[PDB]
């Protein structure tokens, strides 16, 4: 009956139709929650290969022809792999090894972007920053960032209060250990009535050996104290024990008295 046939125009694929998920590890890894990452058409036999590579994401069939997208649902990064660095946002797991770069057959695992803006790393770094695993850079930056914690949410503060109590108990035993000296210094730079209160509390709890060794500017001898009464200026302005003292182990009173020494414009000592 001679039908009037007509062929459709030749197809012109879009950028989405040319997407190859096997080339998109640097596109999918920085994705955040609630964000769809289109990965182009995906054969049915390759869905398990994609879902195992990105267990944190949900594979969603968005359109015809197998058009798919990945939607981040979780962050599975662990504390030892996310907390001891401020630059690594993700890593790849393959054959029991952890790598920074992608490799075929590896499994993506990502860190929370706010892992160092909250207290999600306080427990791991409280232990890791003690003893032989102490990294001075990472641990000082961890304690310092706690004082300016972006999570002003009342739970971000409560984690801050919990860390200060743990550091207070720890540093009362020995304030010479490097993470405690870092804590004392950041309390000094915070310059509040609470932080100064905690400084004096920690320093007064130290042993007689600690005070004999580090705090002789705070606890002068009998003859040193009697001698200082003959001078109008505070003792801390001329006492060699105060010019040789570790500023992190000074009582708040001695630290304030050091800034009252009347410098003659230039070098006044």
């Amino acid at each position: 009956v001679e039908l009037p046939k007509r062929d459709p125009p030749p197809g012109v694929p879009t950028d989405e139709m040319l997407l190859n998920v096997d080339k998109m590890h640097d596109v999918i890894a920085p994705a955040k929650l609630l964000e769809y990452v289109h990965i182009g058409p995906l054969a049915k036999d390759k869905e398990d290969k994609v879902k195992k590579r990105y267990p944190e994401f949900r594979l969603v069939n968005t359109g015809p022809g197998g058009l798919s997208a990945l939607l981040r649902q979780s962050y599975a990064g662990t504390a030892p792999n996310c907390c001891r660095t401020f630059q690594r946002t993700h890593y790849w797991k393959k054959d029991g090894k952890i790598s920074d770069k992608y490799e075929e057959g590896a499994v993506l695992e990502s860190c929370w972007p706010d892992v160092h803006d909250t207290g999600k790393c306080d427990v791991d770094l409280f232990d890791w920053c003690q003893g032989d695993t102490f990294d001075r850079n990472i641990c000082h930056q961890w304690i310092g960032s706690a004082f300016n914690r972006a999570d002003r949410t009342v739970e971000g503060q409560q984690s801050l209060i919990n860390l200060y109590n743990k550091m207070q108990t720890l540093c009362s035993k020995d304030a010479s250990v490097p993470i405690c000296e870092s804590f004392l210094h950041h309390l000094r730079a915070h310059n509040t009535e609470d932080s100064k209160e905690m400084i004096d509390y920690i320093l007064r709890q130290q042993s007689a050996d600690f005070k004999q060794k580090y705090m002789r500017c705070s606890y002068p001898t009998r003859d040193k104290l009697e001698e200082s009464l003959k001078y109008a200026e505070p003792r801390e302005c001329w006492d060699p024990e105060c010019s040789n003292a570790n500023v992190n182990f000074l009582l708040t009173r001695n630290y304030n008295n050091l800034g009252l020494c009347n410098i003659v414009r230039g070098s006044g000592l």
Partner: nanobody
Amino acid sequence: GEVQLQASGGGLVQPGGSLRLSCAASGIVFSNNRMSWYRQAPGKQREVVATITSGGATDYQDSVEGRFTISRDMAKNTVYLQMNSLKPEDTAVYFCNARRDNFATAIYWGQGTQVTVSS
């Protein structure tokens, strides 16, 4: 004559109590003298316990640091010694002391008050 540094506020308290010593100075101005609180146990030499400069910077003996606090009122020209957590070894006669800033001979010693701690 007439440089008065009378110390008061003493008493007998149990260990752990509290006392606020007082010393209202006359003939001497605090904004020009260093005030020091001394004590002398029976049959012992006197020792400085606290001190405050003419600028207000304080300093203490180690055995009383954190427990005692020396303050001053410029209007009232009176220097205080807040004594907290009194230990039995605090038992002594506490008295005032005034020393001129750059005049070494202008030192004066006050009349003491009794502080006893026991049960």
